[PDB]
């Protein structure tokens, strides 16, 4: 059995909530590009967005459960770039199949739907043995990535304490509340949940966007473009969701190393999505840095 060690055990803690997180704007994106919100795509795509973020902060408590605080800072798209994800280690290679696809963010158009679908591709048609050595930091899939954490945690359960630096925004609270072992029983349903709900183990976020790719009439989108002019109104709704988003990833950043949730929260949130939208509605696609 490959031995983990606490440095790279945190390593891999930061890594899963910045796939986490990478995913949030993309997925966001097309969400809002949809112009017709009743349509289907758009609530299979919106309950799969508030989704990662209980994954982002189910990563946040087992990792916080362990000693360590992620940090967040925004994420880039660029090219065919997916944190953490090599495609080249499946077989067959899912990017043979679902594409066009790009990490560059845009509308529900068959390269964003591929892409989501890449990224929540399932670990069992990867044909892999998981990589469990801890220097790995590109693995098959998402469900690859969690197999080797959960490797890293079993070897580390020393190291968890319960209650510590927990967050939660029937069930009870997904946190870790006990120490040592148990914690880590805890900490593995966390994980447990987070797998489910991307490749399944009620309906996961691959067959959702699956569904979408196979359709034949997809809803209608707004168009926009990456670079709008300087001065114009969608540069600005750009530079508008820029800030709002720094903020936002601030105020997590102190929620995940144990702060109070600020009155700002629930504030900071749902404008980002009036934010996202305003662009759009301007002809700008979303930028996030």
Not at 6 to 16: I, K, N
Not at 20 to 43: M, Q
Not at 137 to 156: C, H, K, N, P
């Amino acid at each position: 059995p490959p031995v983990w060690t606490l440095p790279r055990l945190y390593q891999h803690f930061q890594g899963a909530i910045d796939l986490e997180l990478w995913t949030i704007p993309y997925y966001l994106t097309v969400l809002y590009s949809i112009k017709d919100p009743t349509t289907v795509p758009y609530r299979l795509i919106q309950a799969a967005v508030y989704q990662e973020m209980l994954h982002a902060q189910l990563v946040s408590n087992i990792a916080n459960a362990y000693g360590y605080s992620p940090t967040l800072s925004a994420p880039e798209y660029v090219g065919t770039a997916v944190p953490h994800i090599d495609f080249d280690l499946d077989t067959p290679n899912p990017t043979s199949i679902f594409t066009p696809y790009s990490a560059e963010l845009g509308p529900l158009d068959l390269t964003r739907v591929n892409t989501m679908c890449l990224i929540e591709y399932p670990e069992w048609r990867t044909q892999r043995e998981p990589d469990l050595a801890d220097d790995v930091t590109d693995y098959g899939s998402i469900g690859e990535f969690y197999d080797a954490l959960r490797v890293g945690m079993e070897q580390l359960r020393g190291h968890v304490r319960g209650n510590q630096k927990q967050m939660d925004e029937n069930s009870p609270p997904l946190t870790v509340t006990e120490s040592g072992d148990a914690g880590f029983l805890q900490a593995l349903t966390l994980v447990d949940i987070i797998v489910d709900q991307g490749e399944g183990q009620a309906w996961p976020h691959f067959q959702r966007f699956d569904f979408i790719r196979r359709m034949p009439n997809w809803p209608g989108v707004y168009t926009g473009v990456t670079d709008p002019p300087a001065g114009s109104p969608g540069a600005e709704a750009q530079a508008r969701l820029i800030a709002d988003f720094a903020g936002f990833l601030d105020i997590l950043n102190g929620m995940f190393s144990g702060g109070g949730a600020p009155p700002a929260f629930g504030v900071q949130m749902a404008k980002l999505g009036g934010d996202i939208l305003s662009c759009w509605k301007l002809g700008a696609v979303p930028r996030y840095s």
